[PDB]
Amino acid sequence: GTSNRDWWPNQLDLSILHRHSSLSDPMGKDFNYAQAFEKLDLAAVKRDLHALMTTSQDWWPADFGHYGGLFIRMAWHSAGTYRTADGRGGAGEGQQRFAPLNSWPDNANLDKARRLLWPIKQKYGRAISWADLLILTGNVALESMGFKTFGFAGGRADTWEPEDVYWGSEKIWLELSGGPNSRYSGDRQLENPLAAVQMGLIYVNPEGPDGNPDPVAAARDIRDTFARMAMNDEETVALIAGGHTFGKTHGAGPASNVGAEPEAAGIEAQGLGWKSAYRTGKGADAITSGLEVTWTTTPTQWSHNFFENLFGYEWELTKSPAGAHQWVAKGADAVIPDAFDPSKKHRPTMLTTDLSLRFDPAYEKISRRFHENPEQFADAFARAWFKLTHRDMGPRARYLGPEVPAEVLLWQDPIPAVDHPLIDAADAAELKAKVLASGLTVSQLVSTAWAAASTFRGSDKRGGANGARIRLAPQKDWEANQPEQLAAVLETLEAIRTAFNGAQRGGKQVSLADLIVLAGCAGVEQAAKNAGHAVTVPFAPGRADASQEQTDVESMAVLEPVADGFRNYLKGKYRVPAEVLLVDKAQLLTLSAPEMTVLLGGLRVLGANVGQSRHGVFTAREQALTNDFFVNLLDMGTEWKPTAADADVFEGRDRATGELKWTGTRVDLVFGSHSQLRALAEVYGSADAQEKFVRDFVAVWNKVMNLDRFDLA
Amino acid sequence: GTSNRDWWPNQLDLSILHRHSSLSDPMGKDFNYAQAFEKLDLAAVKRDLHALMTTSQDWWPADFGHYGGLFIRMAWHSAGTYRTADGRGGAGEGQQRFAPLNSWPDNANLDKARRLLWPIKQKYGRAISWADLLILTGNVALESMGFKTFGFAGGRADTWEPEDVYWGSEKIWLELSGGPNSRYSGDRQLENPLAAVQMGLIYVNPEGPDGNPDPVAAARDIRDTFARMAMNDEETVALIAGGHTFGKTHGAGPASNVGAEPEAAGIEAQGLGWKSAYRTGKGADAITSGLEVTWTTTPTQWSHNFFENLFGYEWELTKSPAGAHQWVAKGADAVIPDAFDPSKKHRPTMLTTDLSLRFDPAYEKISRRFHENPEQFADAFARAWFKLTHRDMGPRARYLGPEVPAEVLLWQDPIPAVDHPLIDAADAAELKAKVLASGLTVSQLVSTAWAAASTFRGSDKRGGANGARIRLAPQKDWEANQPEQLAAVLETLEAIRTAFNGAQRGGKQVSLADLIVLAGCAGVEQAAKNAGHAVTVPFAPGRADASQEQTDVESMAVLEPVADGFRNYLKGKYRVPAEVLLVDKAQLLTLSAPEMTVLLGGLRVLGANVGQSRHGVFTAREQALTNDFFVNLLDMGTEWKPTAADADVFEGRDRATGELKWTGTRVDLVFGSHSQLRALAEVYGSADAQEKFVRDFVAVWNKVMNLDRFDLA
Ligand code: HEM
Ligand code: HEM
Ligand SMILES: [Cl-]
Ligand SMILES: [Cl-]
Ligand code: NA
Ligand code: NA
């Protein structure tokens, strides 16, 4: 059946904003996962998981009689898709069970792992999500094998359809770099927002870069990809050596024996894939990666044997039975146990990427320290494993259950606790009037609150106005935030705050985070008054102010908006058209296409553009909240043409006279071009729409101000 | 960016069931279009539309100073996409404004038409939908030009994204037949459900079949496509001759001057397309179809000139200025006015397809009768124009406003009015107890009500249990309805009905339509009792019984289910796999994926399968309302394989013994294979889900029973 995507493959795609509707959700509109999970008997689930670890099923027999290694890999792959660039990927939505991730080649045979967990999932039902179960199972694996984890939080609600994620442009699984859709350019520069070296890999190629088995070069790809998943050298080494303390790889025969991935398999395979014609197709005969390496002498027990082997031997390049490059210990005895035959033993073996931990000079220093001090290793790994598996969960307020670690970690972007009474409705009214009496304009107030709140992204639940990090490095210096203007607004609000807090009794006080948001509320109300409309904008206090010492400046860098169509901002020139970036930003803000539309048209006329650009400001009453953006955009009395200076800037001229009326960017004009977005703009551009426009604008403003308010819980 | 569709282009697509969510809708979820329209000042709208007809805009000047022809075509294209096979297409959703229809080649320059209407749309806003406005505008164009219409109903609510319709498999616009994706096979047999001859055309090619200018062969395509749009010979001649009483075609220069269709045009075109480099690109210089034909001596006034020309001249094959085949009157004087230059006149001209009305023997007879009796022509065209523009609106209870014709037409599938008291709750309980005391089984009751209600389709709002048409021809004889079983049930229910009605006073009676539905509800209730559960099934009386004379048997044939996965039925063997057909049927029933899932699992265990097949009946307590389908489907203790006799039937065997436990079809097993469907199945197959299953089942059952209840209004 030919589709619109076939006819117009470059048309903007809005369907990403309409995933996750109530249509596709099987749970009731009132289902609250946190409430279900809080009553789960977590100790009973962990006991069932523990029993499972050594209860082998014949359709996928357990290596060494223990599924621990398999489950650790499952949990590390669930978490391992995460990219800091956009926050997308990660374990927080259980996306490993849907396409494409369920059929990525790096996820081969994790379909067996997830099916082993069905009887438990079935037993506990809605009280434990698949998302939480995948991580929990990895923790119980570790614990059952003598490793003390750092803790665990529940709260990852299940999802019901695939996320629309850009995973690269290659059309062939695992394609080596340098092809027509290469994700590399220049001196091995991986394109943002990607965080893996080949399509369908978690991070790197275990043979080495594009299969070249050089540990030194592989180390470069390790460091680059892991940094793109928010891990530094210490954490990287800890995680890789930690993981590879357990279990084994599977490459017992040629890969051509392995059939279709789960999405391509026949209906009779009932959601499983990679069926293998090699011998029994499983157990002793399994083929997963094609590598056949077993790292330690006790693959089902925590040890420091990974580094004892890594440094205790010299390594020789060899081939697995499937033909893949891997390494074997020179002159060693057969000390490694076999997974099924107690009379067989094997020499120590390593991946190219394991050897990176010894041959890259910076990793070698860490690895030696871990080898000499295995208690340091165990602590690094436990911390790193926690971070890995929690990094997309958002603020600690979302963390559920009895095993949440009490230690507050910098990477969590922590918010201090509130320990005083909050402002009430009458206080909020008083503060809004004081803000408006100070002389701050609608434009300033809107732009500042927008800047503070719109760093949120629903992909990993980072950002938002909570914390007042807009006043700290690096947010205060981001170009989009207009640093000099920002500093003047913040100085005025901080003097308001000081005066209000100094007059209170009873310890009542207002945070600057709350006041920034409340002041934006005042600006929106004032804008509405300017247009002849009395409205109240909702406001919920309870935000707190974080310090500079609680703010990791390097980690915050990825939240810098380099494109924010809502402020008609583009930091530089990108390959992707600006309207595509607008829709991407709307997705991260959790906005539907109607919400995106109303919000953008309102912000234009409120003076939210960076630099006070007139692009898209289609009103003669700037700082009044009206539908003028839509009414003027849609006026067929105006003709639009790209300018000679810049193809991405358009002039709107009266069609009859030639007189210049407006200028706009692609982000403005897409609302009059795209057929779905224009249908939206027409509703808000209609003569009966002033009331609806105002109401819907206020609702979406408030939604944005509250995106990170997980304390309202 | 590579997508799941690119990796697995044959995977079943569920996103068609999740279009039209509250996410993409800009209106509040309480918006009720019927209420808005009922308050519209329709007379005022019509005055504005009258004014518009002769208010020419310089960016698309009006032919002959009157846009009436352009608007008639616009309205006929809006309605013209309709197919009786599935009810999809038609004017009822205003889909001409979205992709692909806004950019079909047959819809060239209708973008200009729609844009002329924006100011009226804007002025009246949400009180008149685009969908209603396009048809209303066509009516007003007719009335402005001297033709009295049969009436008009509002009520077509706007939609906000494209519908997923199969329009064909060709990858080239307008591709002629016999290609790798040909829509024709054999002796010019058009594949169901299609109703046009080439991709991007409304019905037929105006030059003739695959461009061969033979009016006799063009007639055959006309008759076949128009029959597929619910029109017979008389209606077809009336509509073509009626339409081509007005306006003109546009082909003033080569088609290569015409640039990108609206979905491919630059952003500066603001939603318009087909920009032409030929001379002024518009007006006198316009190019739409490439033909240059003006049919009558008064193109802006109703006349009887179409048939005077058709029969009064002999015709000669010639070419338009763009190279297209058309016909010119031999020896005629230059009597046809020019659209812009008062000093220029033209000879009469015709399309190949106009000449079909004279050279096809059956059409010639009708055309002559219309030529001789122009009042018959006028009346036929008026009725046909009404049908064309209303055929997808559904029952008359949906018709709004003060111009609705009082005459009840056969094609509306009329239901008599109810003129007596309805049964109350005590009566419903008494009837359900009588039904259960009669000996009718759960399986019978559920099957019968399912058969009655599931003929509904949301595409044109035809079908459903209202009318009790299941008792009439042809529904009573449909194989899927199990005619012998059906007769026995109906005989028992008719005796219950007669005895209840005969004991009433005060005029109270129950219709058979209501009793069929009520008896199904009793079956569901009894099934719940069988499983140890009290349950209440809602029921709303008020259905009436239609007569055989109110039930057009030929028109009803298109509602016959040749595939109904909800009853594990497939009438023969089709090209499209059975699970794709299941999703298609769910879409027509208006079901989401979770609703489809619960409903199918429940129907299986209640005995709704045609022929009492055991396929998918994964329970040892048939006729009990349980979640057994999901629990058993998901049991990894069973291994599935296709049978040798039939690749589309599967055997489920105990994995450890080889013993046969179940059999199933693709429709059963897809719930265990497709990664999104399996996630839904898991929710209903979990240990905590029995009550959820029951409740969700009853809800969707009730939804199905009420799909045609537009009287509950
Ligand atoms: C450079 C990074 C890494 C590379 C290239 C990599 C590579 C691989 C490969 C190729 C396999 C074999 C799959 C098979 O054939 O079954 C695997 C197994 C495994 N990996 Fe990694 N790994 C990396 C990091 C990690 C991390 C961060 C962890 C967890 C902290 C992890 C834990 C495991 C475990 C436990 C197994 C064993 C699976 C089993 O016993 O079935 N690995 N690794
Ligand atoms: C066999 C069926 C039909 C064929 C093949 C056909 C073909 C066409 C073509 C090629 C045009 C010229 C488009 C352009 O170049 O501007 C057109 C114009 C038009 N058609 Fe038809 N037509 C058919 C049936 C209809 C019907 C059923 C109606 C209405 C009841 C209709 C009403 C019109 C009118 C009013 C125009 C003139 C447009 C103008 O003045 O801008 N036609 N037709
Ligand atoms: Cl994601
Ligand atoms: Cl449709
Ligand atoms: Na994420
Ligand atoms: Na339809």
UniProtKB/Swiss-Prot annotation, chains A, B:
Tryptophyl-tyrosyl-methioninium (Tyr-Met) (with W-91) cross-link, chain position(s): Y203-M229
InterPro entries assigned: Catalase_peroxidase (IPR000763), Haem_peroxidase (IPR002016), Haem_peroxidase_sf (IPR010255), Peroxidases_AS (IPR019794), Peroxidases_heam-ligand_BS (IPR019793)
Residues the record marks as site: Transition state stabilizer: R73
Keyword presence, tRNA-binding: no
Residues binding heme b: H244
UniProt-recorded Gene Ontology molecular function terms: catalase activity; heme binding; metal ion binding
Oligomer and partners: Homodimer or homotetramer.
Protein name: Catalase-peroxidase
Lineage: Bacteria, Pseudomonadati, Pseudomonadota, Betaproteobacteria, Burkholderiales
